[PDB]
RNA sequence: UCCCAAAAUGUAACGGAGGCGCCCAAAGGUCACCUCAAGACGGUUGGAAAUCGUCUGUAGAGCGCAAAGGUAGAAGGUGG
RNA sequence: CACCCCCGUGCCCAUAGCACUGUGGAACCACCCCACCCCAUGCCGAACUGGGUCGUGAAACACAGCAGCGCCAAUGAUACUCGGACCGCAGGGUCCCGGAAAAGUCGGUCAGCGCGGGGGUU
């Protein structure tokens, strides 16, 4: 969710994935296919939903942590400088990236644990399976 | 006044216990020291005197006030402030004091019983943690100040503690069996 | 896998379903360019612990091994492949996957067993006889049973490159 | 007065004019006096025939041709392989 | 340890100098009062105490210094420089020194 | 002094961070010499660190203050 | 550069470094020995230093083996991009044309090159 301590601010830019593996920590995983900002509350909205579906196992890996502070409008003005260090924290995701990947539970019993998680995401994803063997 | 039996009792008896391709290679005694880390709990630009004066009349040498590492940790700590003391012995004065210890030091210790075994400086070097200085052939309460303690270091070319222990004791040393 | 071409220029393939790999050892690092589909259907099975027929256009069957494959992101599709020609008595080192069999005594119990490390690497495989898999006991494993390299029975010879006390599978607790 | 701080913390006004760089590159017919490199630390160390200002700068003692030498980085050297 | 010889050696300027440096391995009793020229790793003169010593080795001190200054002459050298080492310009070494620092 | 500044320089904003209006008869000139942080094992008031000791040790320390570059063959640490 | 090795001093300055192992001794080196004073360790001649064997090669060193770690490091394909030409409301993305990494893989090596002095080939 929210980081523990840091610097305080940032900026904005994009270009395709870079460190989003594939299989690892599980057999089934969910992959993001579009450039976006993933709100930390948009992850909970995913995890939590996923939990419910899984009556146990917790074999859910969320490997897209919010390494980013965004700001906002103190109400209107414009005559002041940097604003709202605290609007919210997001975690820039890029295509091919892997935010989710369950483990242990049946295909179907997974093709749903994701589907749902998809429904609260600002981007389109697609489920991936195996044959992932680069580095280890 | 020692050294022959040093070699002898040790060296020979060593090969006659070991098998050293040389006389040089056998473990020896590099140096014996005395750290006097007093003060800190006792800021006595007075007591500092008790130390050296004494330490010196017991080792026959002027030691160095191993001042503060400039460390100023939360508690009582600061820049480089006199806190402890260093007194390095080696060879003559080493041996001259050394023998005292093996003869009168520990031997003359009420409550004394010998000395723990368990290897120290796995570097074949022995460590000696002393305390009450009230067991010295040179310390006098009827001509001192207050009363303190001290630590002495055993330095030896002793490669392994195996060889260490041996040498250690051969030259003379009380082990609590 | 009848790969035929092998030039720096791939216009003649990039449009036409054809992957593009390279092979070698220390002698010949022949430029290459095999067919999409084929490799695609191929590597699936033999994976990287499977040497296959490499008769390049002209006919010169060669023995190699799937070393490293780098596929496109966004599109699960593979783009490049490295074939490290087989050997005879020694290749280098290989990647062999860990597998389980038989229900574990932790599953029905109250928890689920987890495979801390999917594919495992052992020192020296042994060209000609390199484990195209690795089934492992799990049953015994209860509520916190971790298995490691110092356990897994190896195929007569093969030595474990992976540090021993390293857990390959444990049976994770419930919830 | 009151009972708060003097100036409002968390500001951003100001920075500095600043400079530094390389005044004479490799192959330039340096000269007596010419400055060839302004730097902060010892990025480039006064090679052969180069003096070194107090501000880690570098200059020519004589005339000749500017020359650069980079030994695996870490230590750099500007020299002067005069023509004459 | 090796800091010392590199401290002296370094400070001892090379080409900016033009002059020549005279070493000395008087840590042992087998000195070498060597003389080398800046660039080319070439030793010109040289006057140890290797060819015998007549018993003197800490003693042959100035013998070699005088044996050297004298030496150079058969090369003709006006300017040289003492690239001593860890050796802190004391006696055994000041020997070769003063000795040569006049034998020439 | 950092970042913004788009690998030369330069480059704005009520853009993002932080310091200065000093200090040092020596914290200087020169000449000698030493070399760090830290962990581990073993040792006395000690017992968390700290003092002593022994291994490891590009220095992960230091450099009077803010940062950056720089630096151990010392700009780091003592004495004449 | 007759063959060798040893000592000093360079270039080079990790593909020349480490570690593990073996080789060397009385030519050289070192340890070792004593050291009142020359000069000296804010205490210790441990280190600087003065006077010298024997003994040793153990340590330090030199050399040689080894590549387990370091360090070096392809090719191929990719990232990215100068230039040209397009797409999507936008985040962003593409084609043609050159340039072209980093990481990883193959594999590479435990240097190589000088000057001078010493002692050997009984
Ligand atoms: Mg690399
Ligand atoms: Mg072009
Ligand atoms: Mg363009
Ligand atoms: Mg292109």
From Swiss-Prot, chain A:
Transmembrane segments: none annotated. GO terms for molecular function: rRNA binding; structural constituent of ribosome; tRNA binding. Keywords: Ribonucleoprotein, Ribosomal protein, RNA-binding, rRNA-binding, tRNA-binding. GO terms for biological process: translation. GO terms for cellular component: cytosolic large ribosomal subunit. Gene3D superfamilies: Ribosomal protein L10e/L16. Pfam families: Ribosomal_L16 (PF00252). InterPro entries: Ribosomal_uL16, Ribosomal_uL16_bact-type, Ribosomal_uL16_CS, Ribosomal_uL16_dom, Ribosomal_uL16_sf. The keyword RNA-binding applies. Belongs to the universal ribosomal protein uL16 family. PANTHER family: 50S/60S RIBOSOMAL PROTEIN L16 (PTHR12220), LARGE RIBOSOMAL SUBUNIT PROTEIN UL16M (PTHR12220:SF13). Binds the 5S and 23S rRNAs and is also seen to make contacts with the A and P site tRNAs. Interacts with A site tRNA mimics, and is probably one of the key factors, along with a helix of the 23S rRNA, in positioning tRNA stems in the peptidyl-transferase center. Part of the 50S ribosomal subunit. Contacts the CTC protein (RL25). This is Large ribosomal subunit protein uL16. It comes from Deinococcus radiodurans (strain ATCC 13939 / DSM 20539 / JCM 16871 / CCUG 27074 / LMG 4051 / NBRC 15346 / NCIMB 9279 / VKM B-1422 / R1).
UniProtKB/Swiss-Prot annotation, chain B:
This is Large ribosomal subunit protein uL5. GO terms for molecular function: RNA binding; rRNA binding; structural constituent of ribosome; tRNA binding. Belongs to the universal ribosomal protein uL5 family. GO terms for biological process: translation. It holds the Pfam family Ribosomal_L5_C. Keywords: Ribonucleoprotein, Ribosomal protein, RNA-binding, rRNA-binding, tRNA-binding. Forms a bridge to the 30S subunit in the 70S ribosome. Part of the 50S ribosomal subunit; part of the 5S rRNA/L5/L18/L25 (CTC) subcomplex. Is known to contact the 5S rRNA, 23S rRNA and the P site tRNA. It comes from the Bacteria. This is one of the proteins that bind and probably mediate the attachment of the 5S RNA into the large ribosomal subunit, where it forms part of the central protuberance. In the 70S ribosome it contacts protein S13 of the 30S subunit (bridge B1b), connecting the 2 subunits; this bridge is implicated in subunit movement. Contacts the P site tRNA; the 5S rRNA and some of its associated proteins might help stabilize positioning of ribosome-bound tRNAs. GO terms for cellular component: cytosolic large ribosomal subunit. The lineage of its organism: Bacteria, Thermotogati, Deinococcota, Deinococci, Deinococcales.
From Swiss-Prot, chain C:
Residues 1-104 are annotated as: N-terminal domain. GO terms for molecular function: 5S rRNA binding; structural constituent of ribosome; tRNA binding. The keyword Electron transport does not apply. Keywords: Ribonucleoprotein, Ribosomal protein, RNA-binding, rRNA-binding, tRNA-binding. The keyword DNA repair does not apply. Residues 105-175 are annotated as: Middle domain. GO terms for biological process: translation. One of its GO terms (cellular component) is cytosolic large ribosomal subunit. Part of the 50S ribosomal subunit. Contacts proteins L11 and L16, the A site tRNA, and the 5S and 23S rRNAs. This is one of 3 proteins that mediate the attachment of the 5S rRNA onto the large ribosomal subunit. This protein has three domains. The N-terminal one is bound on the solvent face, the middle domain fills the space between the 5S rRNA and the L11 arm contacting the 23S rRNA while the C-terminal domain is on the edge of the intersubunit interface and contacts the A site. The protein conformation changes upon binding of a tRNA mimic to the A site, although the mimic does not interact directly with CTC itself, consistent with CTCs presumed role in moderating A site binding. Belongs to the bacterial ribosomal protein bL25 family. CTC subfamily. This is Large ribosomal subunit protein bL25. It comes from Deinococcus radiodurans (strain ATCC 13939 / DSM 20539 / JCM 16871 / CCUG 27074 / LMG 4051 / NBRC 15346 / NCIMB 9279 / VKM B-1422 / R1). The lineage of its organism: Bacteria, Thermotogati, Deinococcota, Deinococci, Deinococcales.
Swiss-Prot record, chain D:
GO terms for cellular component: cytosolic large ribosomal subunit. The keyword tRNA processing does not apply. InterPro entries: Ribosomal_bL27, Ribosomal_bL27_CS. GO terms for molecular function: rRNA binding; structural constituent of ribosome; tRNA binding. SUPFAM superfamilies: Ribosomal L27 protein-like. The keyword Oxidoreductase does not apply. Keywords: Ribonucleoprotein, Ribosomal protein, RNA-binding, rRNA-binding, tRNA-binding. One of its GO terms (biological process) is translation. Belongs to the bacterial ribosomal protein bL27 family. HAMAP family: Ribosomal_bL27. Part of the 50S ribosomal subunit. Contacts protein L18. Binds the 5S and 23S rRNAs and also the tRNA in the P site. This is Large ribosomal subunit protein bL27. It comes from Deinococcus radiodurans (strain ATCC 13939 / DSM 20539 / JCM 16871 / CCUG 27074 / LMG 4051 / NBRC 15346 / NCIMB 9279 / VKM B-1422 / R1).
